[PDB]
């Protein structure tokens, strides 16, 4: 049986947009209900979205697990400030439930280093984001360090992201941007996240087995 997303697209349901609600462990194809925000209730480009749609179309197994527990994986940073009026819920501010927007604890964003090794018996889909403040004043209020960077690397993926501080058009009340990235982890591989700021870490991943 297919996947009937009620009021979200793929990007809305996979990122954990707070508007999506309600358990599928297999689906032939996806029924994506459109939305204005394009799934991204926080403005930003989704890198290789069609590539991820195409490989989410037909899966035979689909487990969702907490790759990085919120209450224990981020001790030197603040994992509780990352909510926005752009992604609301129940009247208050919220955020994607499968990501965590990390922010400096105190007045310091110490270098972040976290690794996950695929202990599963199938591929693991990992989603993260890169935030770009509108002004450098926001950068220091969020990440303390002005020369921040993000490094994401596995055995088949490697990229260094740099903050792109620019005043963009006011979309969804926000002139900052937040790009979204993904990659698949082979059953024996390790993915690593290095950051001195601007990283929206994964909180939930997905272990899946696809068809054709």
């Amino acid at each position, epitope marked *: 049986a297919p996947l009937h997303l009620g009021k979200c697209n793929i990007a809305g349901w996979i990122l954990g947009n707070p508007e999506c609600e309600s358990t599928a462990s297999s689906w032939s194809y996806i029924v994506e209900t459109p939305s204005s925000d394009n799934g991204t209730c926080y403005p930003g480009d989704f890198i290789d979205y069609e590539e991820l749609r195409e490989q989410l179309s037909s899966v035979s197994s689909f487990e969702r697990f907490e790759i990085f527990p919120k209450t224990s994986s981020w001790p030197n940073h603040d994992s509780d400030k990352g909510v926005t*009026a752009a992604c609301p819920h129940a*009247g208050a501010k919220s955020f994607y439930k499968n990501l965590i927007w990390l922010v400096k604890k105190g007045n310091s964003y110490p270098k972040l280093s976290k690794s996950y090794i695929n202990d599963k018996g199938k591929e693991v889909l990992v989603l993260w984001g890169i935030h770009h403040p509108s002004t450098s004043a926001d950068q220091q209020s969020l990440y303390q360090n002005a020369d921040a960077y993000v490094f994401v690397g596995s055995s088949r993926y490697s990229k260094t992201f740099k903050p792109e501080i620019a005043i963009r058009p006011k979309v969804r*009340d926000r*002139e900052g941007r937040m790009n979204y990235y993904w990659t698949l982890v082979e059953p024996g591989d390790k993915i690593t996240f290095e950051a001195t700021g601007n990283l929206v870490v994964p909180r939930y991943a997905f272990a899946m087995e696809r068809n054709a």
Partner: antibody
Amino acid sequence: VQLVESGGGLIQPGGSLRLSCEASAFTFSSYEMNWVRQAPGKGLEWVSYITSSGSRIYYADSVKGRFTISRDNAKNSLYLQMNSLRVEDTAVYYCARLLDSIVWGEGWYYGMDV
Amino acid sequence: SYELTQSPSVSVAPGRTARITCGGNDIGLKGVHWYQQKPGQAPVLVLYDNNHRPSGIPERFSGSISGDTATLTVTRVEADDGADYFCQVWDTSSGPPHVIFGGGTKLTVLS
């Protein structure tokens, strides 16, 4: 942590005074400051606000063009220059600091700590 | 021009729960902050950003956002808790950045 204010008293209408708000036991240069008044028996009313850098300075409508915010981080003191005072300006004037600085582009506001 | 509506008086008995409400258009998206002012004393921040509780504030103080209505909840209410409570938001969607308070809710403890 403590904020000591003074400089207030009795002014005749059209007159002026300067309030001061000195800081102790915290790094006054990294916190964003505020002035809030309270009529003799009424409620709280925000007067004005300034960042730690002295960059952003906002005022309430009823005091624009009459009150000016200033701060000297070199002396841990915040100022309110009140010109063209009126009878409805009679109130208790509090200074207060925000927990964490306001994240404007992200819409993050924190309360007033001390 | 934006207005935070707030009830003026609430009366509770010793030991019960008192709920002070603060109404405003999109109050949760802005972040509502609560202050406790005792007679003759300066205000005391008891809640910021809707739910977050400052240090030294007892866990008896909590906050919820039910859409356009914010609520300060005080459990095991005692005579020391009797004071005036004000809510606060920042508003950038009604002109220049300006701060708005509520009228204040006097909590009488009936002790």
